[PDB]
Amino acid sequence: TTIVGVKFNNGVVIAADTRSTQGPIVADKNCAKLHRISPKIWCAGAGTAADTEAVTQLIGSNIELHSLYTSREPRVVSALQMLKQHLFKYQGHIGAYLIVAGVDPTGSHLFSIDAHGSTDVGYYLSLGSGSLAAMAVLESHWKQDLTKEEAIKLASDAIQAGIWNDLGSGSNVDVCVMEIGKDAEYLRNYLTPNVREEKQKSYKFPRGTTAVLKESIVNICDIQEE
Amino acid sequence: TSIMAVTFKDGVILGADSRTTTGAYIANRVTDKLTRVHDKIWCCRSGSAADTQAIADIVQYHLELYTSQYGTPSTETAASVFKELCYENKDNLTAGIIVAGYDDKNKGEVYTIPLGGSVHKLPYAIAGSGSTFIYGYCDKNFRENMSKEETVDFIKHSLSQAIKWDGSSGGVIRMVVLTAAGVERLIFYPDEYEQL
Amino acid sequence: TSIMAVTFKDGVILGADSRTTTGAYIANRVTDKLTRVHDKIWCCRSGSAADTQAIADIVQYHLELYTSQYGTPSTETAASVFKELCYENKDNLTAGIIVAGYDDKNKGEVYTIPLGGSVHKLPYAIAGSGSTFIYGYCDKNFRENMSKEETVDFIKHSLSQAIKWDGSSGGVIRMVVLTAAGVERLIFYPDEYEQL
Amino acid sequence: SDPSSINGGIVVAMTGKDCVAIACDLRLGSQSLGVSNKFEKIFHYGHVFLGITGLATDVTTLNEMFRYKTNLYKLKEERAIEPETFTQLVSSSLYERRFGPYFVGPVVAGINSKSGKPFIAGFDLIGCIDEAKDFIVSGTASDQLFGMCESLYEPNLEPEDLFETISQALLNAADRDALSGWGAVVYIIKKDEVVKRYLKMRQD
Amino acid sequence: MDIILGIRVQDSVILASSKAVTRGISVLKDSDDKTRQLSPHTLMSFAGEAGDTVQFAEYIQANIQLYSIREDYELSPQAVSSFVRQELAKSIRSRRPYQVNVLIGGYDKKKNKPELYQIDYLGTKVELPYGAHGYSGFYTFSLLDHHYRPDMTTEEGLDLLKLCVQELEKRMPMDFKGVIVKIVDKDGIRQVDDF
Amino acid sequence: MDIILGIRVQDSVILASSKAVTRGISVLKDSDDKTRQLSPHTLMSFAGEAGDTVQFAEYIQANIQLYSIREDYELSPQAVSSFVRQELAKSIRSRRPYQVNVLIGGYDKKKNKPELYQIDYLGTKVELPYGAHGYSGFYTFSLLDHHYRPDMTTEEGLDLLKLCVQELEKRMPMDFKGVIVKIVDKDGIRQVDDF
Amino acid sequence: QFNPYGDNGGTILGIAGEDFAVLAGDTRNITDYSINSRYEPKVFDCGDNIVMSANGFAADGDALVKRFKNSVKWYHFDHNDKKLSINSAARNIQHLLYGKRFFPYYVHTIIAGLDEDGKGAVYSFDPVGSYEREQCRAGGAAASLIMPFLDNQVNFKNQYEPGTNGKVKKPLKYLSVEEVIKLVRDSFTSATERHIQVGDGLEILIVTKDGVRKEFYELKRD
Amino acid sequence: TQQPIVTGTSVISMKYDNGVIIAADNLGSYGSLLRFNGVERLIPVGDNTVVGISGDISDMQHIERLLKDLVTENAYDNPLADAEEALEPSYIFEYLATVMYQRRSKMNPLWNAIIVAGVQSNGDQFLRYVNLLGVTYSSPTLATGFGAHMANPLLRKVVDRESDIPKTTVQVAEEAIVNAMRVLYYRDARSSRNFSLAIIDKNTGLTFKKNLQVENMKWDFAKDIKGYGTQK
Amino acid sequence: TTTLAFRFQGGIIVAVDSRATAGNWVASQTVKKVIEINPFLLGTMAGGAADCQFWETWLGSQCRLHELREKERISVAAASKILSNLVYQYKGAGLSMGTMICGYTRKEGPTIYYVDSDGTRLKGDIFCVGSGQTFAYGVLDSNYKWDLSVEDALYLGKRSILAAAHRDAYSGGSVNLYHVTEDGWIYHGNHDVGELFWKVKEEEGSFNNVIG
Ligand SMILES: [Mg+2]
Ligand SMILES: [Mg+2]
Ligand SMILES: [Mg+2]
Ligand SMILES: [Mg+2]
Record's family (chain H)? Predict the structure, then answer.
């Protein structure tokens, strides 16, 4: 997994690859790692995939209720405080490593949080097995006062470094851009540089190739009238 | 990590490097290890980042609630709350915390709380992995009732040496000055302190 | 243990504390850790006392036999013999040795041989458990081409601080001065160096 | 010792044109010992199908649990649960045992009764959803299944072509796994007819 | 305990269970009956850890007898086996699990069919024509796979069972002191007193 | 291997040794002869680790046969037992010791006396009226302590041996598949083919 | 503690035709999640119309290939430049491997060539020298992904003739070198999709009576 | 079997159109202690080869002496020692690779990762890696330790495959190497600012640069960073 | 793995399965588990594949040297003992071997020795070794007679491996049959278990539990 977050002029951008693995085996080639905590607060998760999904949805759920209770749009610091206190309580047993980014009435924000509950602030961050490859790119090209277009470019380049160089990362680049005073734009499969080439052969079988012992209709309908 | 707090004539100054490592990888080279638990009561954190952050947040909460009821807490009171958390949860914590604050009655005060959760009031304190390399230097160079400029130089030179020898320390030298005049943040970059 | 060797204008001076511990018990408070392997080639020993003594004795033998055949050995040659023993037997040795010597051609030279058996030629070297506390101080205070009196003060002050903070170090500060004039032994007692 | 490979077995699911297929082997064993050749691993709640590999006691327990829950769902909702909703229910149910999990590899397959869209999904033992467009694999021969599916699969296969593809994927994967085989079943699922076929295979 | 075998024939279920009870060095008993009658037409044999086997078996027996009295009705073998499986499936994630493997042989009076269920201590249930627990299957299943027919008489089942026991007595290192054999059919449960 | 018993009566030594060879799960053989004739009037039974037992026994046999040829003379049972003990005492401090326990039953033609020696793998030698290795003594010694007489006939020795084997067959968990019995007397070594 | 072994990933595949043999392998070399090289040749021409690959721990793989190449050289010296037949090479490799029975070459070795009747031959070895002549053998990381596919598409396993419904097997008709190469390419393309250690490039060595030929194909680099 | 004591971190290298570049910092770490600050970890062999070594420094010094001895030995009874029969990068590597594998096979490794960079007699670039296990591989870019994770991604953006090598000038290659060294200084806790860089070119020969420093560093953005979440 | 060998009136029947596994992964279905030591001697493979292959090939070399030197066929007793003595030297080092050395000579008649890597050497009439040995023993014990015909004995060995191949997860692939006579062994073919199972089920009426 390679995940990055990059601050820019009027907001923040987050990006991720789309490979999920079981050891050395690729389970899903187009995984969605960019998660929505609230409309304009998004985060990307590395580590235990279900811990990243579950902790997002739980805090996302509570953030929504909090927003309704206070009649205010959710803040990134609230999502952060709720995430870290939940993760700290479980002493790293919930293996969620997240980059949390968003915009709110206070402004634009970018944070990282690790499984044990420690958080960090930054203008550029990377997480996952391809974080070192990504951070190499970020440390080479990041500057203050990036534009939206520059930040999207830098973020996706950092993910690409992970895709090509990290075996844990691959396939596509997902991006989400959160700009102040605008709707957050989720760009699913922003880049697609790993389409499989056409195979040499079609492996469609002739009908009746498989040996069959018994056939029967399965009753999926409910008990019928009359 | 290299952290220290030093009392001087007009109050106290906290100092820290900015390096946070995961093994040999520098996970954050611009970390802020100087944390505010009250207006003029700050702390330097060493050990588990999760633990020291959790502790600091709880202390900040306690001092906020204290202030609402009883007014501004003393630095000693803040140190006591830190100690209570560290001592009672010693089995599950890895935290080494220096507490520094400015009263008008007591002026600059420094309390160090090492791993066990004991408290020690000192004229100055050093902690973190990098502190080992500057026990000799700090002991030889510290004087009581230094000026602001002298104390800044003392901390700058000390943390410079800690950074030079300790791989776990590095980045910028952050400092927070606590006096009657208010709260001042200082930062010093490698090109400055490496040539000292 | 706190040991160091420092080159200066007229040659080199070796310095050491005199404490030998078995756990927290001081088995010998007047140990001589400055060892002679040749007339003007000495060494400071740290680590296993059995190992460093065995090594030093073998080196002394080698240099004696060298001298009988080829005349006075260089300090470099002595360091090389130390290194050969330490490197080739690294699995079975716990030895950290500083080698210091005076030639007339090369003058004062210092070589440090840490645990692995690597060699490092330095202007000065510090080693032993107590050295950790004086990296900052020694780096800030060392100058090249000091006088004899300045080098004695530098070593005295440095080992004073190492002794102050390290429980494994203590007792008297021994020193051996190596110059063209000859070999001079110096000793400094606690009442002298503790008030520095 | 490893709970996910005591009993053995495999499930595979595929999508086709206006259809889905889900298939499983019939073996239950105690490590090397073959115990049953009639242990079906696919179940259904209304029109939603659920395959479960892994520890057999959990396979049974989860089937009973999801029958339980989908029956209450139906009574309250006054409609049969859909594949998308059920997938979330499986995920939720598995994650609630985060630190004492069912040692299973569930696979959902079905067609949404309102949109007509074919749906498949896979899970790890604590509920992480893998919602693949093409195919989902699970069990002690998941590597072999991945290899078969990756080469044999092509999109938009007609029901009777999809049958051959999934059958051959299962059979040949199972024959390279000691703990899978002893018979196989393939469900071909269309919007309002489901056909179930038992396959003839080697019995070693 | 050691060997427990089960075979479902045409009109009955036959359970064979060893008589030996060994506590480490010595064989303390050679006439132990490793079975409990759960209801008039349902028998359960068991094997596993000492103490837990009988404790579990009697606990199940009490529960089924309680159900029988409350409803004035005998639960089907299938229903009993499902109850037993749940108890074991509950048990495996307990503080200290029941280490007990069972065979449930019952005659369903409604369907007029014999039924044999094999359940291990994990709560792994399977309905079988013949079954075993432990190493018993390793020696006997090749013989049962060969000779078994679904239309076998009770007498033929007993003869096939004898061949299985003979093979066990030949190739097993442990002396299990023979077996007690019990037949479950429409008339209830009875013990074959000469085997 | 498992049970090896020895009893020295009036005019002979009787060695009883189990017939079973078990390799973990299966009994591979039920007719194994765990003994070697070292000389015409000296027999050695053995038990211990697989492979080492036969290797040691045949090694000893070869050595005694070599001595017999070189000197044209049969070593006394005492002399043979001392040779064997030294080999085992040497073996116990070797890189890989022989894990072999032996009984040496011999008839001394010079003294006209039967003699039974018990030696374990450490080289612990004792001359006994009756002996065993492993757990065999635990079951049998109470019977031998009661019934044994130094003036017993060979037939009475065999009857007392039967009682010992019967007790073993009752209380031992393992099936050792009976015993092969051999008698050592003035006329040499012979096997009792019905026991 | 020092671990003398490592895992350099990689996947190899040997297929014996009627009058030819191919030995293929990906060119990616890895440790853990890093790529060492995108092109590090793994299948080698060892002379005498024999090709060899020792997949697994690359240091042992290189050592073994080197020692076998050397064995070919000395076979020529000692036996009047006699050609080392594939069966003789296979037996010789067993002895090389079993020579380190108690400190094995951590590799799965495959050799390919022609037998003395000119028919395609592939031999497969385990780390300690047990070996077999085989028609079809994948080795390394993605072997479990590839073999079932080969069982189905080379040996036509579980395939029956339409209309007979399981009564008549699909006949085992001989495959051409072009047909085998298609299956090799599709095997590695599929393996590249689902296995993280497979990718970058595919190098195939083809052995016929005319000699050894090479073919290279790009694989996905992610 | 041992454990490394005094250690050197990343060695990084890449090929360019006319030769190879190799670089490594001048630090000798003693665990987390940055003990020795003047350690040369690039060792030239003749005028056509530079051997870069990371890992255990005592073993590095041993290897350094082996290479020194190799030059002496090659010159013995060799009239063409400074011409046709001079040591090639490929000879030097193969020798080291033999030693490394032999040492691991005796369960007594030289605890190092080594990159041999050079130019062959025919002008061909040579760049190959060997480590304590005897594992060897070649690539357009090679790096050890942290450099493998952080330098390679950056260097591979310049030379991604073999066909990029002729398109890469010495200026572009050196620029990429120097930037990578800066990135490693930012992110490797066992790195130093001071480093050495060697260029082996088929035309201009061996250029050995000592006392280089990481420069043009970005730290100013640190001033705005406050707290770890909610602090203002 | 399942290997068996038994003595009978017409000599020795050797029958083996063909499966090799690494964990749950089936590495091969075409493993030759009968090692043709020479035209008169057979060995079976169980435990370590390399150990069995290597040392039983080596055994063939020793047997060949014996008959060159002594101008006489080596006895099964002598041949088996060469192997058992060899593996006994390596005891502790981690060899894995469970084999039946099978032969038929003038002086001995048909003879089988179970040889094993912890140094065991047992002469016997029926031996079964491997993960599926217990299943094969059941069929063997209940059907074995000395006066079996060569045809019936061959089938009994085949059927016994099939019984194991069915129940044992780590046995299967195919069955290899051999008949050892005084004049040498005779190979009786490779029999795919998949096809053999259905054939035997129908013709024999066995495996009623399995639907076909
Ligand atoms: Mg530093
Ligand atoms: Mg199978
Ligand atoms: Mg890949
Ligand atoms: Mg099987």
Answer: Belongs to the peptidase T1B family.
Quick one: tokens of H208? 């050995």
Q: Which fold has domain I1-212?
A: Glutamine Phosphoribosylpyrophosphate, subunit 1, domain 1 (3.60.20)
Query: Sign of the C-alpha dihedral, residues I169, I170, I176, I178?
Result: negative
Residues linked to residue G11 through DSSP beta bridges, in sequence order: G140
Q: What is the resolution of this structure in A?
A: 2.9
I207 touches chain E (CB under 8 A): yes
Ligand closest in space to the Cα of D177: 2
As a whole number of angstroms, the distance between CA D34 and CA I170 comes to 10
The CA-based angle H223-H224-H227, given to 5 degrees, is: 100
The CA-atom distances, in angstroms, between F63 and each of D32, F76, F101, F120 are 47, 14, 18, 19
Question: Which phi and psi (to 5°) does residue H56 adopt?
Answer: -65, 125
Q: How far is CA G103 from the centre of its chain?
A: 23
Structure tokens at C81: 């013999």
CA–CA distance from C32 to each of C151, C191, G178 (Å)?
A: 20, 19, 83
CA C115 to chain centre: 15
Q: Left, alpha or beta for E124 (phi > 0: left; psi -120 to 50: alpha)?
A: beta
Backbone φ/ψ region at E115: left (φ over 0), alpha (ψ -120 to 50), beta: beta
Interface residue of C83, C85, C118 to substitute, partner H, most H CBs within 10 Å: C118
Q: Which residues, in sequence order, are CB contacts of G99 under 8 Å at separation 6+?
A: none
Q: Please tell me what DSSP assigns to residue E149.
A: -
Measured distance CA(E63)–CA(E115) in Å, rounded: 20
CA angle B73, B74, B80 (to 5 degrees): 95
Residues of B in contact with A88 (CB under 8 A): 50, 54
Backbone angles phi, psi at H114, to 5 degrees: -125, 135
Q: Answer for the pair B135, B16: CB distance below 8 angstroms, yes or no.
A: no
Q: Nearest-CA distance from B137 to chain C in Å?
A: 4
Range of the domain at H181: 1-232
Q: Please, which residues have CB within 8 angstroms of residue E24's CB and are 6 or more apart in sequence?
A: none
Identify the residue whose tokens are 């044109």: D17
Residues 6+ apart with CB under 8 A from H216: H182
User: Quick check: do D and E touch, 3+ CB pairs under 8 A?
Assistant: yes
Which of I141, I160, I208 minimises the CB distance to E149? Answer: I208
Token pair of E129 as six digits: 């024509």
Place of tokens 């693995």: A21
Pairwise CA distance, residues G90 & G74, whole Å: 16
* CATH superfamily of the domain spanning F1-195: Aminohydrolase, N-terminal nucleophile (Ntn) domain (3.60.20.10)
User: From the CA of D37, how far away is ligand 2's center (Å)?
Assistant: 12
Q: How far apart are CA H154 and CA A168, in angstroms?
A: 18
Beta strand A107-113 pairing with G120-125: unpaired
User: Which of H136, B25, G197 is CA-nearest to residue A166?
Assistant: G197
Q: Which residues of I touch G98 (CB under 8 A)?
A: 50, 54
Q: Is I49 annotated as a binding residue?
A: yes
DSSP states of D89-101 as a string?
HHHHHHHTTTTS-
CA nearest neighbour of I158 among I13, I10, I21, I9: I13
| Total domains present in chain H | 1
User: How many domains, in total, are found in chain A?
Assistant: 1
Which superfamily does CATH assign the domain made up of D1-204 to? Aminohydrolase, N-terminal nucleophile (Ntn) domain (3.60.20.10)
Architecture per CATH, domain C1-196, reads as 4-Layer Sandwich (3.60)
What is the side-by-side order of every strand in the sheet holding A11-17? A124-127, A3-8, A11-17, A173-179, A185-191
In chain B, domain spans: 1-196
In angstroms, what CA-CA distances link F30 with D12, D16, F22, G138? 50, 62, 9, 46
In this structure, are residues B91 and B130 in contact, taking their beta carbons and an 8 Å threshold?
no
Rounded to the nearest 10 degrees, the angle between the axes of helix A76-89 and helix B49-70 is 110
